[PDB]
Point group: none
Chain length 81, copies 2
């Protein structure tokens, strides 16, 4: 679990992994993340523009396929510090 500092207003960008036939699902603090006006999920990428401090949290992407289900975690701290 690696740390990511994002300055408020900037873009949080996370990248999961490349596995053939694996569809990527994202969580923040265990809760599900999907697409919205500030959230885009594409390929193995997660983008959130307009970082605010409550965007801070423990993000994780799980690449699941039928055979297996591998997982990466990112600790995101959105701060002016």
């Amino acid at each position: 679990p690696e740390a990511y500092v994002v300055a408020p207003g900037e873009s949080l960008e996370l990248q999961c992994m490349l596995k053939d036939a694996a569809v990527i699902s994202w969580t923040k603090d265990g809760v599900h993340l999907g697409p919205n006006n500030r959230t885009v999920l594409i390929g193995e990428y997660l983008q959130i523009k307009g970082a605010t401090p409550r965007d801070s949290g423990l993000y994780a992407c799980t690449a699941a396929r039928t055979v297996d289900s591998e997982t990466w975690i990112f600790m995101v701290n959105v701060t002016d510090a």
Copy 2:
């Protein structure tokens, strides 16, 4: 984020911490089934297969998180 490694075939058991507990895996809400039992603060899934791995999380505000790794390693 707590680590839990289980060997395939064995029983995956999670125990929540610090109220009625609801479990998610990779964001999806879990209920009981023929290999899953949810009781008290416990989550049990028997017959672990590598696809049972994922990011589990238990909540009642407060939330506790588990990275489950099912491997023979």
